[PDB]
Design a protein around this nucleic acid. Sequence first.
DNA 1: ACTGGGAACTTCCAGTG
DNA 2: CACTGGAAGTTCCCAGT
Lengths: 274, 276
Amino acid sequence: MPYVEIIEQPKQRGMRFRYKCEGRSAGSIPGERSTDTTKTHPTIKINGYTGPGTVRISLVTKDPPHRPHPHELVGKDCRDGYYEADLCPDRSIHSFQNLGIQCVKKRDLEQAISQRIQTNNNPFHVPIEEQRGDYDLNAVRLCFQVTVRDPAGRPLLLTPVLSHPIFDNRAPNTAELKICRVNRNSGSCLGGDEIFLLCDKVQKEDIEVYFTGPGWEARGSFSQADVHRQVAIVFRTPPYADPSLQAPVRVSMQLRRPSDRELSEPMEFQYLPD
Amino acid sequence: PYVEIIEQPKQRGMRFRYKCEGRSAGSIPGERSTDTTKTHPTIKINGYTGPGTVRISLVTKDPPHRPHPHELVGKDCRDGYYEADLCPDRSIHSFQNLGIQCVKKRDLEQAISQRIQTNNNPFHVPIEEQRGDYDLNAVRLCFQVTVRDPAGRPLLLTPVLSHPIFDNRAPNTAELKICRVNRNSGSCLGGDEIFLLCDKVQKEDIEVYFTGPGWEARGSFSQADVHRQVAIVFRTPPYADPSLQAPVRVSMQLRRPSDRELSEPMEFQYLPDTDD
DNA sequence: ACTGGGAACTTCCAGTG
DNA sequence: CACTGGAAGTTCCCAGT
């Protein structure tokens, strides 16, 4: 097959989701390796054609089978909850740079679904029986629809492909994990130290404090009633896998999430005697 | 005959409950309502003791005292008012299942229209001085009482206003509590670092206050210190003392400058720096 | 069953490129 | 002044009794 390939996947974290009341554009979407300096945008590649036709982008649930989604895509060449333009005959390398996510309100859900049905907005034209399930309105996936030409001048339509799942930063249970301030950055190795920490949004339930050394796992101890307003954690430092020590040695302290396992920035922590 | 108040409503530590919540709102306390000696808000009327009807409505904090786009919900209440029937026996009366329920910025107009309709305006302020804006955290209580004159004809009395009532999602006007403190003994010289965790506070409206027998001390932090309005990182100030000898006791709290309010008071000790 | 309270959803907005 | 987080307003509900 002349086919469809995804190269710049999208930045799963680091983005928030905006409603009908928050500017009809919401900037654009970054690529997984975008970082302000070398700031890139999501792209695809086509192998076995370079010429005219059509490109479409729709929105599908994370977990399969992948239904259309009750959320909308807004900006350039965008309409009816997707993006439609005309493919560029120049190359077979493609970038989408004015791209938005609009989230729809949980009562407007059924309306949205109806609209999608009306459109035929469904890559994997699934039955309207299973299109009942339950919905994920944190997480969205990207699906690609393409029409080209055989060496006659018909239209020809290709295998539709999936992206890394894309997440909401205002959203609590899938927010990007950051550590903002701290109360110290070195106590004794013996463990007992109690530490005051200020962070981006975190939920008290699913959340630990995680330490890694040259092979070594420790967890530092606190109850869901030490978590003050979801942005503050108070804990006790687990002793070292070597109580005796003597020198100073330095490790890593992070925030994990037992369900998905996503890790914060790492901040440097040092261990002492007496 | 005139109407006087003996217990007030509790100025804060109460929350305002939308129509989508509507559990009542529990009830409203008096000002000196303990958890054990629970009271309610009570009024006494001096010069006549006999059959009666009494009405309470909602008027803006702001004078002129307008009608307020809010309601009172509970027993004997409807369209944002309470009307009942007095015990003619006593001149001592308290009201017990009482609620404040709040309305959604669009549905302001609707509420105001309803007030206009039901002649909720016990200071009959014209609609020219009903314009602009209102106050949404904060409402006042107005009492209108009807009696019998020396004949038996019906008579109405000059109606009175009470210490105002505030809502604790309203950042500039809730209670001011503390919750945890990593450290509560530190240097009197200054240059020692303390972490304090609290209910909601604005980041341009807040200080930190230290008091002895007549004395004010302030500890200084930039604004981008107050993290998400629950967390403060700030230095413990230089004390009234070049270098101590004994250790000395202060009271330490949270003060907000707009309205100069105070929080719980908690004990902090300074210990005589024989090294740095 | 009730409250107290705590987060989860939703809307605005000010500050800084 | 177009994004960007923070914060404020609204709804939901889970934990205490």
